[PDB]
Design a binder for these strands. Sequence first.
RNA 1: AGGAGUUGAAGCUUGGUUCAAAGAACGUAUCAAG
Length: 243
Amino acid sequence: EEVEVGINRLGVLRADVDNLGQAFINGIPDDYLSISRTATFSRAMSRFFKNYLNQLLAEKSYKINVIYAGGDDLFMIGAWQDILDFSIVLKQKFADFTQNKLSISAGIGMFREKYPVARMASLTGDLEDAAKDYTKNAVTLFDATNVFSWDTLENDIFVKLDAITKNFEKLDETGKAFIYRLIDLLRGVNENQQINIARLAYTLSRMEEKIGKTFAQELYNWANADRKTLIMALEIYILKTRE
RNA sequence: AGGAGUUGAAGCUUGGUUCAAAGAACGUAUCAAG
């Protein structure tokens, strides 16, 4: 109820450190090998997760309830806006703490307000298992069909989302019916590949004078080069801007 | 004293202009949370 910007959903993060097993067992090489170094390694990992997770969630008023944390396990239920905006924060702070050599995978799920927590946790655990099945670092946005690498998600999806949010704000009457027709074409293009690309070019030059001279050609470029990213960018755009 | 021979011929048969715009994109109830 404090959120008054997006869709009334509850977003769920489950994360775990991948490849933690052989790194914890035999990670430090045999030449410069110490026992207290391993003690600092594991004690610093648990230390990081506990105190930096509480401080990173305290410094900005994130509407996130942490259930439990740890290296092996992480489970947080909150508003989906803060969960999505905090997953990149947690990934980058883990990369800074571990000097970006311990990988991390995660799974973001999104559920309605009154949903059972047991089925919630099982579904999001399934999502993050599908993320770690890719066998590298990745994340699933809301579904097992949308698996993205962390740099891919962060860079591609968030620059496309920020560009879309800059462009459709200054437009006075374009959204959101144009965006729904655009998503209809960009998900029909998976099966009927040619005619939806033709309809896409037709609509973009149709609304060249309306949505912008350069944004329409940018959408036409993005919808051929890195397509599947832009569908998720538009979907989370509407999920953010729904009143 | 009137007879014949032409009863229409050629040209254009539509030209250009916007060719679905804005809205809603599931809401609730058990499930859950408290």
